[PDB]
Design a binder for this molecule. Structure first.
Ligand SMILES: *[C@@H]1O[C@H](CO)[C@@H](O[C@@H]2O[C@H](CO)[C@@H](O[C@@H]3O[C@H](CO)[C@@H](O)[C@H](O)[C@@H]3O)[C@H](O)[C@H]2NC(C)=O)[C@H](O)[C@H]1NC(C)=O
Ligand code: NAG
Lengths: 49, 49
């Protein structure tokens, strides 16, 4: 080669996503007392989430 | 989670119906109907006691 060129290029990368939290009783029962008292003889499927 | 609020009162709202249902004109009713030509009747505006 006898001459050259300067080239500027672009690269795009994800770094992070959104952070969420879920309330187990409010999603399942929803301020019911008949429910959320039946959802107490089920196991620990709400701390593990 | 939510453990801090408990519902206290309980309210009931029903429409203003006063006359009782005709249980006694469809329950003694000197002559009934044959099974093959059974009788159908509509009931409306009742306090079904
Ligand atoms: C290596 O390549 C570069 C281009 O990347 C050459 O530079 C260029 O030189 C030419 C001739 O001198 C320039 O043309 C001129 O254009 C202007 C109008 O823009 C005009 O008024 C002048 O009379 C002439 O025609 C050209 O623009 C210029 N490019 C850049 C970006 O500067 C360079 O000469 C090459 N070198 C070798 C060793 O071949
Ligand atoms: C049948 O029901 C009507 C409605 O209350 C009543 O007036 C009538 O005395 C009843 N007849 C008998 C035999 O019970």
């Amino acid at each position: 080669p006898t001459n050259f060129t300067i080239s500027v290029t672009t690269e795009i990368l994800p770094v992070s996503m959104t952070k969420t939290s879920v309330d187990c009783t409010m999603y399942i029962c929803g301020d019911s007392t008949e429910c959320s008292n039946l959802l107490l003889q089920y196991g620990s499927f709400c701390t593990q989430l | 989670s939510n453990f801090r609020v408990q519902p206290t009162d309980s309210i009931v709202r029903f429409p203003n119906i006063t006359n009782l249902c005709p249980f006694g004109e469809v329950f003694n009713a000197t002559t009934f109907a044959s099974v093959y030509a059974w009788n159908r009747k509509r009931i409306s505006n009742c306090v079904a006691d």
